[PDB]
């Protein structure tokens, strides 16, 4: 099933707003009923749209709408494997541009 491995600013990290955030998961996802939500301190912050760039399924790119201030951040995702099957999930971090 599709669990995260591997990722862009992982929970608890200090970074700069990244361009756009890469989830990598075991399980390829289909783009089309993926969602991912941003919020900083429990406002949502708009999202351009999502999208697989790659060949493989298996990474999940999202675009935020806007450029992040510094303070503390949590991103909530919903993903479906190529297998139908669907997981959620959420993790926090801190923009220190």
């Given at each position: 099933?599709a669990?995260?491995?591997?990722?862009?600013?992982?929970?608890?990290?200090?970074?700069a707003?990244?361009?756009?955030?890469r989830?990598?998961?075991?399980?390829?996802?289909?783009?089309?009923?993926?969602?991912?939500?941003?919020?900083?301190?429990?406002?949502?912050?708009?999202?351009?749209?999502?999208?697989?760039?790659?060949?493989?399924?298996?990474?999940?790119?999202?675009?935020?709408?806007?450029?992040?201030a510094?303070?503390?951040?949590?991103?909530?995702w919903?993903?479906?494997?190529?297998?139908?099957?669907?997981?959620?999930?959420?993790?926090?971090?801190?923009?220190?541009?």
């Open positions: 099933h669990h995260l491995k591997s990722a862009t600013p992982a929970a608890d990290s200090t970074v707003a990244p361009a756009d955030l989830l990598t998961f075991s399980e390829g996802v289909e783009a089309t009923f993926t969602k991912v939500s941003l919020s900083k301190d429990g406002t949502e912050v708009a999202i351009k749209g999502l999208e697989t760039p790659d060949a493989d399924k298996k990474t999940l790119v999202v675009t935020p709408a806007a450029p992040l510094a303070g503390n951040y949590k991103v909530v919903n993903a479906v494997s190529v297998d139908t099957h669907k997981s959620n999930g959420e993790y926090s971090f801190k923009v220190g541009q």
